[PDB]
Design a protein around this ligand. Structure first.
Ligand SMILES: Oc1ccc2c3c1O[C@H]1c4[nH]c5ccccc5c4C[C@@]4(O)[C@@H](C2)N(CC2CC2)CC[C@]314
Length: 442
């Protein structure tokens, strides 16, 4: 019995001792840092303070739990039992709560930048931390009193005593803890980060396409034709008198412009522009059936053309259109490539035409990638998910799948996973040391 169990028990005592050392001292150091210095007092970092407190509390109880696997009993007492269990559950909850609040906050920062400035204060983060701990206490305060010491045959056991029927409330608890400590929060993170990950890459819609084409300038400028244009391709007038252009600008905005407008106003014009482009596509009988017979992408390209030169001029290329609605792509590209349009603005027309030919935004794709902090938070979350996915899924499988406790193969698997889940709490401080400038310069 002992040639098997003892080696593993001692090895686990060692591992647990290491995770305890590094984990506790690291997280305490981080807490200390976020408190003392002012160059660290942001929202995200306060969240990291919460994560640190939780994980340090988790790593403090690690000796007592290695004593469990060595001595095969609980010698210390019942208050200590209550404490270790309570803390274990607390860590399990506050960790994931804090992580999803970080992901939401990061998402707010990056994806909603204009409005971020107004409610991303550190006091907000502090408030949120306190709320996290209370919602945790929702589950933690009962666990603290339902933890009790009862002698199983041959040993003294520190365990949870669900009021009879025990097994019922047991499975209920394993379920609720599977949902609200795993499935739900991970889904929230997946929505947030999914959004701020899908937004970064290339271009994928008409608006961003035209933003690449007509570009953006705040003050009045003379376009490729020599006319007075402002913002994103918005034509003001034909009159070479600049005063006329400004009068039209004040006419189309509603204040005294002074020749320069704000980006919000440029876009507020842009919308009505693409509007009229579309309404024009529908009003024109020569466009609508060629428009309705297309997929969203090539539709967007057609709208690019109409935005550039109007339904008047787009209607002219009848043969090209007939090639388009015939779905003979490369032929339509052939006819379009040789015209006045390609001659005038060659590059843009080349891109739009390629778009027409392939049915993708491939001709427009330029790839940026993440951010400093955002990528950091991503990594931290991925780490937590990797450490806690086994043990969370396992505990559910274990209570719902037969063959449990059959052999050391499985028992070793399970214990390895409990371990990994714990080791996360020591992995956190290592990560901050590589991923944040505010931590590494110190
Ligand atoms: O409902 C839980 C979900 C996930 C985890 C457990 C939960 O009840 C504890 C629990 N009961 C079990 C019964 C059979 C096999 C494993 C467990 C564990 C695992 C663990 O002891 C560990 C995993 N700690 C967390 C810590 C290792 C990360 C939290 C409390 C507990």
């Amino acid at each position: 019995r002992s040639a098997s169990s003892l080696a593993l028990a001692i090895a686990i005592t060692a591992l647990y001792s290491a995770v305890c050392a590094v984990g506790l001292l690291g997280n305490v150091l981080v807490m200390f840092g976020i408190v003392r210095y002012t160059k660290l007092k942001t929202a995200t970092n306060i969240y990291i303070f919460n994560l640190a407190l939780a994980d340090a509390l988790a790593t403090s109880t690690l000796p007592f739990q290695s004593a469990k696997y060595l001595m095969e009993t609980w010698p210390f007492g019942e208050l200590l039992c209550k404490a270790v269990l309570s803390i274990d559950y607390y860590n399990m909850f506050t960790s994931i709560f804090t992580l999803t609040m970080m992901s939401v906050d990061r998402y707010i920062a990056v994806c909603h930048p204009v409005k971020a400035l107004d409610f991303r204060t550190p006091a907000k983060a502090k408030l949120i931390n306190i709320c996290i701990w209370v919602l945790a206490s929702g589950v933690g305060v009962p666990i603290m009193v339902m933890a009790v010491t009862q002698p199983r045959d041959g040993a003294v056991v520190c365990m949870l005593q669900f009021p009879s029927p025990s097994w019922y409330w047991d499975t209920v608890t394993k379920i609720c803890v599977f949902l609200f400590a795993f499935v739900v929060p991970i889904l929230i993170i997946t929505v947030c980060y999914g959004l701020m990950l899908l937004r970064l890459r290339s271009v994928r819609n008409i608006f961003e396409m035209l933003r690449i084409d007509e570009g953006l300038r705040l003050k009045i400028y003379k376009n490729t034709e020599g006319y007075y244009t402002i913002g994103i391709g918005h034509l003001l007038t034909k009159s070479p008198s600049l005063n006329a252009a400004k009068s039209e600008l004040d006419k189309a905005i509603g204040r005294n412009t002074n020749g320069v407008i704000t980006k919000d106003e440029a876009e507020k014009l842009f919308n009505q522009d693409v509007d009229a482009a579309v309404r024009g596509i529908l009003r024109n009988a020569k466009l609508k059936p060629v428009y309705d017979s297309l997929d969203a992408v090539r539709r967007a390209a057609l709208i690019n053309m109409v935005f550039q030169m109007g339904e008047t001029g787009v209607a002219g290329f009848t043969n090209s259109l007939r090639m388009l609605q015939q779905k003979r792509w490369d032929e339509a590209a052939v006819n379009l490539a040789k015209s006045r349009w390609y001659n005038q603005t060659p590059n843009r027309a080349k891109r739009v035409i390629t778009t027409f030919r392939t049915g993708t935004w491939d001709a427009y794709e330029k790839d940026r990638s993440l951010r400093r902090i955002t990528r950091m938070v991503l990594v931290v979350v991925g780490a937590f998910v990797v450490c806690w996915a086994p043990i969370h899924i396992f505990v559910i499988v274990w209570t719902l799948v037969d063959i449990n406790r059959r052999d050391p193969l499985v028992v070793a698997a399970l214990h390895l996973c409990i371990a990994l889940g714990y080791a996360n709490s020591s992995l956190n401080p290592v990560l901050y040391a590589f991923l944040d400038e505010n931590f590494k310069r110190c």
